[PDB]
Design an enzyme around this catalytic site. Structure first.
Site, PDB file in Angstrom:
ATOM      1  N   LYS A 147      39.275  49.815  -9.551  1.00  0.00           N
ATOM      2  CA  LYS A 147      39.476  49.686  -8.085  1.00  0.00           C
ATOM      3  C   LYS A 147      38.798  48.394  -7.637  1.00  0.00           C
ATOM      4  CE  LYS A 147      41.476  53.873  -7.473  1.00  0.00           C
ATOM      5  NZ  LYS A 147      42.839  54.065  -6.925  1.00  0.00           N
ATOM      6  N   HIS A 180      52.497  57.417 -16.573  1.00  0.00           N
ATOM      7  CA  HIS A 180      52.127  57.775 -15.183  1.00  0.00           C
ATOM      8  C   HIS A 180      53.336  58.409 -14.492  1.00  0.00           C
ATOM      9  CE1 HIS A 180      50.780  57.677 -11.069  1.00  0.00           C
ATOM     10  NE2 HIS A 180      49.542  57.642 -11.576  1.00  0.00           N
TER      11      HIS A 180
END
EC number: 4.1.1.39
Lengths: 86, 435, 106, 136, 435, 106
Positions: free
Chosen positions: B153, B272
């Site tokens: 992040k 994903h």
């Protein structure tokens, strides 16, 4: 209606399974394309022997076979050829 | 001539469960015969060309109707499709034939595919997973414990070098893996080839340091099929054990040529589940996730996102790992599925978890799963390296407690606080993410 | 704030303080309880690249109690003091190792 | 541990019919268990590596013996092989695993494979004919 | 016009020995002229097209008939075939022209090819062995002694990693080679590419340990010719000195393109003789193994399975190793075969031998052979590593005793027992496999 | 049961206990008896990858007795104590080495 026929009828209906009898003429037997004759999902021996003698006579000169069907989802358990063409 | 209740499903046949909501004044028999027809050899009128081909053999037919308890004009439909009419080793066709345009039918307001059974004969045509669980643990040399991943992040902003260093500090502490975000592709700010080169320098660094095999999922997802294969030629070239892909967004055909290539080359692929929430969200409309999970296992995939926690989630988790799974209507499973020796896919748990959810996730998911902390590692008071050792010591504490024979539902808060006494890094993290 | 010191780590149960011989007994008790086959492995050097260690005797197929696995541990510890040794647990149904942890350092 | 008559064959299983002529002084049970063993996960001695893999699941086994009418030391053997152990879309493997070196066994003078059944699940992996009659 | 006894064979001619059993009421001359005809330019009727081509020059003819002693309607037929009519550097044609459909003739009940002679002119067209014995010893750096191989058991069951470890322990003790089973191809439970990767880790491990060159035969046998070459591209890529093939089952043309490829790349090829026992078993019907052994030497192959022991076996063993071999009817050899500088093939002895058969097999096979223990190494009381050291010390004891000048037929049991005194590993194995 | 110790091995006749000078004389007697050409080779380090050692003098083409090869062995042992030394036997008909065994360790 042989002794092998009614024991399998009794073995099928002693499992809680339902009987279906199916016929086929010699030509469509190639491709394993059978059909239902009489009343489906049979759950007693006398309905089985009555529509067996109905279908031995209704489609004489055709294959006829008995099916043991588990009523849960209609799953095919046991398949056996009773009558064969002459 | 489409609705036939007396029919008894064969073993070489694909069976489907539809949750149907008809238009009022529409019977339960006609709306069931309409989706059974419109998916396979169905036409609004009688045409003459139907008398040359044998329609009886190929047609899909509805054999069982079950009304949904406590629901009006809501019932479950069971349809059986002969095996011959689908093409061999392609999800694209089975998806196309069944759930094509039976949706958006005028006879019915809402429609939802709940489940899908594969006969074993059809299962054999596919490659399935390029490796599986058993194969994957053997290449990485990791046993006993759930595996630990990390999402960098923020999602878009960092330079290729800054990305390379933020990944270095995390695997140094003692994470197994690091992960690229689902929307990073070839953004102008960091090009893929630069990101691929700096991540290569940081894995070799922390490998020679801690003395363990480390990895990073390199997102390969690309607009065209040349670019995708060409980017992957480069990951193989830097000796990367793993890459990753989003299967829903790129399409099943994109995901297919990849998996064949990946089995050809012996690279482990992460998947994903980006863009899942738009189809499987509504309980009246869409397709259930368990259908898509099967479709993934068959397409191929070594890892898959399952989502964080309940009775429904353990239904499709034991469905992806076990060789044989039994019909259980309370769990959410309608049919008996049997996999023909096909390797299992490892469960991936990611999305908003800290060091206090640690007892809950080792017990439910078990041993064969990957636990991934997006916000839980970077946001440590002391940085990325202490934040990693925090989550590492907390997992190993619960795995030791479990073996000796302690219930982690009862003594769950107890094992985390004992461990907090001799390690400084967990004492500052127990403080921050409270109850 | 504190900076994380550089440490060479050894797969499963290495971030916890070095294991007591009682903690050793409870983890092998779990191996024999689930029905898996416990075994002893030794190697000279510990590296991420090599994935086969030298096997100590045979996997103990006939193991009733956890004490018989501890006595095999101390006899290898006595034979090779300057070796890395670890105990593994083979499963026979799923064809895979369940557990792998390091007990003695050179 | 190779001869098990009680066994009922599954649908996803390849079944074989062998015409066996044993050496005199060899029972009908041991020469049947020997060709069922030597074709698939069979070894003359007990080895230790067999306790790590699940032998019960993979092993081929003889379930039925039928004596040939009007023939001494001549009988038909029926052996069942689990589906998993063969490689997909290759005659080369099925030919190799079964009729490999069960022939030229010292326990038996003559051996003949009569027939071979393919479960439908295995049949799907192959291309089969490039066209067929109807196409041609 | 096919039976001509006066004919004297030329040097550039291929000669064949057939054991014939005619139907009763069939003369010895007509059934001999019928197999001489039906193999080469033979037809049941006189056709007009035979007067445009020169039939006398091309035709194969029977020149000698020898009745088999103590046998009624059983005799040896000698037929000579001109050199021109066969295609150059192809076993496929020579096999096709001769033993095509002369078998299953109505005139005769049983037929057996005993032997086949190759003129030197025909021998030169082939590549033959990619290396040979002399070449092979030089790449591996092993002199004096027979080489020791091991077959991993069980045949099908183990995972790719479990296979990798079971191979590691065997070469560690001190075996030269390890070997894949003849029915392991690309089985669902272990894929070839996974098996190929784990065996690569275990060889490099035991190479840096014991300090010797170690190998493992990687079974390459594949259904199609693309797959076969593509799997082999991968074995070259992991720097593997050896692979292996089954020639009978894959066919001669499959085995051919391979051997050309193998000489191109400098990889040694092992050949297993799977499915030999169905042809060469019966003494009245089939083809003798010595014909197929010749056919192998010419096709090419660095190793070949010869089978364990006697007068017959040493016949075709000295036929594969020696440059020049003489006619010996008692041994089983019918013709004088002369090889034109073509390298020799190494004998492989495998199938049910222990540490007591050790004296018998070094004396009979000699020095240039490979001794392979399937059940004899793994089934040791103490495991794979001591079981290897057991067979190694037992070989080196017999080789030292032979050099000094001891008869291993008289003092064979003696050398095994005086070696059992200073090594613990042979004392427990001498105990187990007794007499 | 016993675990097999880790040992660095040296090609032919290395698993047998180290050779006495009489056992050396019998094995070279076998070389001269068959009619092969015995020679002496030395190298500094012993590894599986290198396949050429430094040759000592010439192959002794004129060798009648097994004692002349033993005297060539001791003069090299004296010159290079910290070298690996092995004796080989060239054949002249089949163009290949028959025997290769290591006599002195550094």
């Amino acid at each position: 209606l042989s002794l092998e026929t009614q024991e399998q009828i009794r073995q099928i209906l002693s499992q809680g399974h339902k009987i279906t009898f199916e016929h086929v003429d010699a030509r469509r037997f190639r491709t394993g394309s059978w059909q239902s004759c009489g009343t489906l999902h049979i759950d007693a021996e006398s309905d089985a022997i009555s529509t067996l003698e109905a279908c031995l006579v209704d489609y004489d000169g055709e294959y006829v076979r008995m099916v043991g069907i588990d009523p849960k989802g209609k799953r095919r358990v046991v398949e056996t050829i009773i009558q064969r063409p002459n | 001539t489409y609705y036939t209740p007396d029919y008894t499903p064969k073993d070489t046949d694909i069976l489907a469960a539809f949750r149907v909501t008809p238009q009022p004044g529409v019977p339960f028999e006609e709306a069931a015969a309409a989706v059974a027809a419109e998916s396979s050899t169905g036409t609004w009128t009688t045409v003459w060309t139907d008398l040359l081909t044998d329609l009886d053999r190929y047609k899909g037919r509805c054999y069982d109707i079950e009304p949904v308890p406590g629901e009006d004009n809501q019932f479950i439909a069971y349809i059986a499709y002969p095996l011959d009419l689908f093409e061999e080793g392609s999800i694209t066709n089975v998806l196309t034939s069944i759930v094509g345009n039976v949706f958006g039918f005028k006879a019915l307001r809402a429609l939802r595919l709940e489940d899908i059974r594969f006969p074993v004969a059809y299962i054999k045509t596919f490659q399935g997973p390029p490796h599986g669980i058993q194969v994957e643990r053997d290449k990485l040399n990791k046993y006993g414990r759930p595996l630990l991943g990390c999402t960098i992040k923020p999602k878009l902003g960092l330079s290729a070098k800054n990305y390379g260093r933020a990944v270095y500090e995390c695997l140094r502490g003692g994470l197994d893996f690091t992960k690229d975000d689902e929307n990073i592709n070839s953004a102008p700010f960091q090009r893929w080839r630069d990101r691929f080169l700096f991540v290569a320098d940081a894995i070799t660094k922390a490998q020679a340091e801690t003395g363990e095999i480390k990895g990073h999922y390199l997102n390969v997802t690309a607009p065209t099929c040349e670019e995708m294969l060409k980017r992957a030629e480069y990951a193989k070239e830097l000796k990367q054990p793993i890459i990753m892909h989003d299967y829903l967004t790129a399409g099943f055909t994109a995901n297919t040529t990849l998996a064949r290539w990946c089995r050809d080359n012996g690279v482990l692929l992460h998947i994903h589940r980006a863009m899942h929430a738009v189809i499987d969200r509504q309980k009246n409309h869409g397709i259930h996730f368990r259908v898509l999970a099967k479709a993934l296992r068959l397409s191929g995939g070594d890892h898959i996102h399952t989502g964080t926690v309940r009775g429904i989630t353990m239904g499709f988790v034991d469905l992806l790992r076990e060789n044989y799974v039994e019909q259980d209507k309370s769990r959410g499973i309608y049919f008996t599925q049997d996999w023909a020796s096909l390797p299992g896919v490892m469960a991936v748990a990611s999305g908003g978890i800290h060091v206090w959810h640690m007892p809950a996730l080792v017990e439910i998911f078990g041993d064969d799963s990957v636990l991934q902390f997006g916000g839980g590692t970077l946001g440590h008071p002391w940085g990325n390296a202490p934040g990693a050792t925090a989550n590492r010591v907390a997992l190993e504490a619960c795995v030791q407690a479990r073996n000796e024979g302690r219930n982690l539902a009862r003594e769950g808060n107890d094992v985390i606080r004992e461990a907090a006494k001799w390690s400084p890094e967990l004492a500052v993290a127990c403080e921050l993410w409270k109850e | 704030m504190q900076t994380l010191p550089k440490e060479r780590r050894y797969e499963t149960l290495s971030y916890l303080p070095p294991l007591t011989d009682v903690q050793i007994e409870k983890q092998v008790q779990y191996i024999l309880s689930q029905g898996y086959i416990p075994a002893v492995e030794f190697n000279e050097v510990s590296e991420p690249t090599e994935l086969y260690w030298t096997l100590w005797k045979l996997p103990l197929f006939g193991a009733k109690t956890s004490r018989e696995v501890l006595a095999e541990v101390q006899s290898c510890r006595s034979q090779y003091p300057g070796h890395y040794i670890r105990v593994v647990g083979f499963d026979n149904i799923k064809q895979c190792q369940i557990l792998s942890f390091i007990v003695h350092k050179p």
